[PDB]
Amino acid sequence: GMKFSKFGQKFTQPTGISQLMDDLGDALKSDQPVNMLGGGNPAKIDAVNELFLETYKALGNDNDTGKANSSAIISMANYSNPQGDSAFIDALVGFFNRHYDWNLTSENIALTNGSQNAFFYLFNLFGGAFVNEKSVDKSILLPLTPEYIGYSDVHVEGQHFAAVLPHIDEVTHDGEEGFFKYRVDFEALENLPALKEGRIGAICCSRPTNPTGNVLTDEEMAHLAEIAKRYDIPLIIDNAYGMPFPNIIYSDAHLNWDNNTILCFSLSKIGLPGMRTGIIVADAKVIEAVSAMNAVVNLAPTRFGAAIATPLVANDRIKQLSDNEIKPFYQKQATLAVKLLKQALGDYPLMIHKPEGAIFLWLWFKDLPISTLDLYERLKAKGTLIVPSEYFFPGVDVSDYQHAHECIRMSIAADEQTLIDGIKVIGEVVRELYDNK
Amino acid sequence: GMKFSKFGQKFTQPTGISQLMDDLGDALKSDQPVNMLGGGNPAKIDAVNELFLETYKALGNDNDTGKANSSAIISMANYSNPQGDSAFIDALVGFFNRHYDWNLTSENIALTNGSQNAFFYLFNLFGGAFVNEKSVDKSILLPLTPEYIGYSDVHVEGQHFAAVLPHIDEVTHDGEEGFFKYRVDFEALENLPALKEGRIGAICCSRPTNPTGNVLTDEEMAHLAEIAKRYDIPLIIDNAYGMPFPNIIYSDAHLNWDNNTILCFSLSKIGLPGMRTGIIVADAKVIEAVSAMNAVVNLAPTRFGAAIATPLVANDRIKQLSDNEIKPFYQKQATLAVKLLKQALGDYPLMIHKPEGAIFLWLWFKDLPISTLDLYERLKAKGTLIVPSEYFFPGVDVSDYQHAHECIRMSIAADEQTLIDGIKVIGEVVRELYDNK
Ligand SMILES: Cc1ncc(COP(=O)(O)O)c(C=O)c1O
Ligand SMILES: Cc1ncc(COP(=O)(O)O)c(C=O)c1O
């Protein structure tokens, strides 16, 4: 009746991620109450919203006497340049140069409709079909998996990711056992054939990581920069939950840049996800590409998130908000979740990834009699929503890797009572599964 | 250095449109002042901004006592569904059903990051490579050109437009001659080999049209709807400037819809272009596609435009604003511009397209000794910026198309003094050209 192109058939195709996203969106839009521990929406932090309401009001009250011209109206009533809101870009240049001495200019920053829009651009700019120097497909290299589920399907044709599986070390957290950290396997990575065949167009990772809450160490990051410069490809770093804002990082870490680094940031995780504002810091050549892409796909990127954020970047309040209100909120939430998980399981073979950042806990059930896609169904049936591990391994076949079927992602951004009720159910279901064969 | 994919090379490649867009972006950002008649930004209408400012304040002042839980905060602090802001869609459902009785449900409406985002989806959804019935390219049929410059480059691979040239009839405007109206050449369109052979994926047009100000007639639209139904392809209609908002239409027309129609609206031309809100009314099948694409490309679309517009849709003030303030503002500006053009030229071979809508005047210099691309360069060097006609014929080889080198687009959204100064220079330069061989 209505014929779509090959392009349309790819976005119309059912997938494991597409079915899962339908289920998350169905509960959010439904009457049946649920224990929502499966989304990525930030927490409702009161001190944060009080600052945003003040900034909002101020933008509508700075007009000249008896005249329409408030900042709120100017931002609404006009298209930004395709590269993004000029004032916000200038504010960002000043901010980054004050705090890190990178010597940026406005040519080094672009805005997109959320970081997701930035990955849609960046992964189709450095992956997919390249001219053979007669056509050669190159991949985005994820040096460590599990990694962000949202990367998976952004390519315009086929799928173009290469991943290296991680080394697992059992570690300690707050004086107790039953924790672990994923580490980059440089033996596997440095010897990766795709890299020597010239089939890798970029390296990319999130810091801290969705879904694990893992923070790749400064030594791991410096090593990745060497590999990136060696193979003459950019190192893309997704700071959605990281420095300098919202700075939801609990372990020692430093933010760096050079002309070979592409740094992505967002306003979603400081509490402005409805605004859809991503920020890219890169070499002039990358910013030009993104700006041209915005011109064609979007005309101009959105600017209301840039309007609220601008004065908060100018006076460093965006940093104070992050360090004083956002970071502590999520740490107390993660500590409470760990406490409750250890009360439910703890005698059982549950491992919790060292919570070093972001808004999630990553739970690993060693030798569980069912897969975590199965646990996901059983928990959804009882009103508790979590995300199963098998969709966080883009670029690697996990049908033959059992660790990929033994974990779940749980949001610690949910309110206290949701965490209490959700973890109670997770405990009952899982204990009952371990107690029988 | 940095090496890009083929997809990327399409956006690095300087086209005629990217070089024109750079000159228009440079003129704005420059210290040198200019008579800016080349943009597409809507006018600053005081009555519109007063209503917007009131709405903005109201959304931030409906919090419960001593709390920051206002509508503005809720809208900022949460991702919408990938299909778009639920409340805004429900308001739109009610609104269209009140005014047109199309029996829509929420399944028929999706939101995008401006209508440009809608065209990037729709033209790639129904154009480019299709599975053959080993594969076959299909095009988006533009039943009459000139058409919107922004459609040109949205295809992911190559360019897939089949454009039909117009018939021209001399018409009158306000008791005066020196006007014309483009009309659909149904002989040429209905016999196009691509159409007969099944190589056209959809039909598309703007109503009113950028850059001409032309409104395709009710009879012309009915015919296109039959042709579309016959060939199992949808009719996409861009109402950026049309009914019911901003309703910048000065001639008799009807807004119609059915399941084979894809109606695109926008909040940009009512005065909120900075917010980036596109609206699509279509069959469920098309909306699901858009939703799935938003999920991958954007996570969710922007919502602050939705937040402002929701109450103005609920109480029909969006319609009253359009009819009482926006529509009359532009008619008086177009009238003023025509007056001024007839004082400058008028004795000369200037034809003006009958201004039936949108925010531009389309000027045709019969037998101009230079090309309008050349006129553009001369005016640019004397501080006045307009847009040359050769970029408004997507998919047409304009290298030996006389008519495509004889017109200019002029914005009548500019303030009065810009129109007086600009037209004065346009008059001097053009008269001087006609006066010598
Ligand atoms: C690691 C990570 N990066 C990027 C994003 C996308 O964020 P946005 O497009 O809202 O900026 C998400 C959000 O879920 C995420 O978890
Ligand atoms: C006819 C037409 N359609 C659509 C658009 C795009 O509007 P939006 O701001 O909604 O992306 C424009 C240009 O701004 C236009 O002139």
Question: How many Cβ contacts (< 8 angstroms) between chains A and B?
Answer: 269
Alpha-carbon dihedral sign for residues B400, B403, B408, B413: negative
Three-class SS of residue B364? strand
CA separation, residue A16 to residues A387, A394, A397, B285, B428 (Å): 11, 12, 14, 20, 65
Distance from CA of A303 to the nearest CA of B (A): 6
B171 forms beta bridges with B179
Q: Starting from the edge strand earliest in sequence, which strands make up the sheet with B360-365, in order?
A: B167-173, B176-183, B350-353, B360-365, B407-411, B387-388
Is the Cβ pair A128, B6 closer than 8 Å? yes
> How would you classify residue A184: left for phi > 0, otherwise alpha for psi between -120 and 50, otherwise beta?
beta
Which position has the token pair 């409406």?
Answer: B109
Question: Are B73 and A49 a contacting pair at CB < 8 A?
Answer: yes
* Ligand 1 atom with minimal separation from the A119 CA: 4
Measured CA to CA, the distance from residue B263 to residue B118 in angstroms comes to 10
CB B115 within 8 A of CB B299: no
Q: How far is the CA of B357 from the centre of ligand 2 (A)?
A: 14
Task: Output the CA–CA distances (angstroms, integers) from residue B344 to B339, B422, B427, in the order listed.
Answer: 9, 11, 5
Under 8 Å between Cβ of A338 and A355: yes
Closest residue by CA, ligand 2 atom 1? B210
Cα→Cα distances A348→A176, A259, A378, A406, A427, Å: 15, 48, 19, 14, 10
Cβ partners under 8 Å of residue B48, min gap 6? B270, B271, B321, B325, B326
Look up residue A157 and give its two tokens.
């044709």
SS (H, E, C) chain A: CCCCCHHHHHHHCCCHHHHHHHHHHHHHCCCCCCEECCCCCCCCCHHHHHHHHHHHHHHHHCCCCCCCCCHHHHHHHCCCCCCCCHHHHHHHHHHHHHHHCCCCCHHHEEEECCHHHHHHHHHHHHCEEEECCCEEEEEEEECCCCCCHHHCCCCCCCCCEEECCCEEEEEEECCEEEEEEEECCHHHHHCCHHHHCCCEEEEEEECCCCCCCCCCCHHHHHHHHHHHHHCCCCEEEECCCCCCCCCCECCCCCCCCCCCEEEEEECHHHCCHHHCCEEEECCHHHHHHHHHHHHHHCCCCCCHHHHHHHHHHHCCHHHHHHHHHHHHHHHHHHHHHHHHHHHHCCCCCEEEECCCECCEEEEEECCCCCCHHHHHHHHHHCCEECEEHHHCCCCCCCCCCHHHHCEEEEECCCCHHHHHHHHHHHHHHHHHHHHCC
Q: Residue A145 CB: number of other CB atoms within 10 A?
A: 23
Q: What are phi and psi of B111, to 5 degrees?
A: -115, 145
- Which atom of ligand 1 lies closest to the CA of A278? 11
Give me the amino acid identity at A69.
N
Q: Is A346 left (phi over 0), alpha (psi -120 to 50) or beta?
A: left
CATH, range A1-437: 3.40.640.10
For chain A, give the number of residues: 437
Query: Domain locations in chain B?
Result: 1-437
A212: Cβ below 6 Å to ligand 1?
no
CA distance, residue B351 to nearest chain A CA (Å):
31
How far apart CA B186 and CA B144 sit, in angstroms, is: 10
Report the distance separating Cα B36 and Cα B269, nearest Å.
18
- The angle formed by the CA atoms of residues B84, A75 and A297, to the nearest 5 degrees, is 50
Distance (Å, whole) CA A6 – CA A13: 10
Among the listed residues B233, B294, B297, the one whose alpha carbon sits nearest the alpha carbon of residue B259: B233
Q: Is the CB of A268 under 6 A from ligand 1?
A: yes
Side-chain half-sphere exposure of A79, counting CA atoms within 13 A: 23
Cβ of B242 below 6 Å from ligand 2: no
* Ligand 2 nearest atom to the CA of residue B267, by list position: 10
Q: Are A226 and A184 in contact (CB under 8 A)?
A: no
Spatial separation of the C-alpha atoms in residues A92 and A267, rounded to whole Å: 13
Query: Got the DSSP string for B216-276?
Result: --HHHHHHHHHHHHHTT--EEEE-TT-TTTT--B-S-------TTEEEEEESTTTT-GGG-
Residue A116 CB less than 6 A away from ligand 1: yes
Tokens found for residue A372? 């975590």
Task: Give me the amino acid identity at B328.
Answer: P
Pocket residue to mutate for ligand 1, from A210, A239, A359, most atoms within 8 A of Cβ: A210
User: What burial letters (b/e) apply to B115-139, b meaning 16+ CB within 10 Å?
Assistant: bbbbbbbbbbbbbbbbeeeeeebbb
Across the beta sheet with A176-183, the strand order is A167-173, A176-183, A350-353, A360-365, A407-411, A387-388
Binding-site residues from annotation of B for pyridoxal 5'-phosphate: 79, 115-116, 148, 210, 241, 266, 268-269, 276
Nearest to A118 by CA among A285, A309, A277: A277
Query: Among partner residues A63, A130, A292, which is closest to B11 by beta-carbon distance?
Result: A292
User: Position of tokens 């004086």?
Assistant: A175
Contact assignment for B297 to A6 by CB distance below 8 Å: no
Q: What H or E segment, with its residue span, contains residue B281?
A: strand B278-281
* Residue A177: count of CB within 10 angstroms of its CB: 10
Report whether residue A115 contacts ligand 1, using a CB cutoff of 6 Å.
yes
Q: Label the pairing between strands B261-266 and B235-238.
A: parallel
Q: Cβ(B40) to ligand 2 under 6 A? A: yes
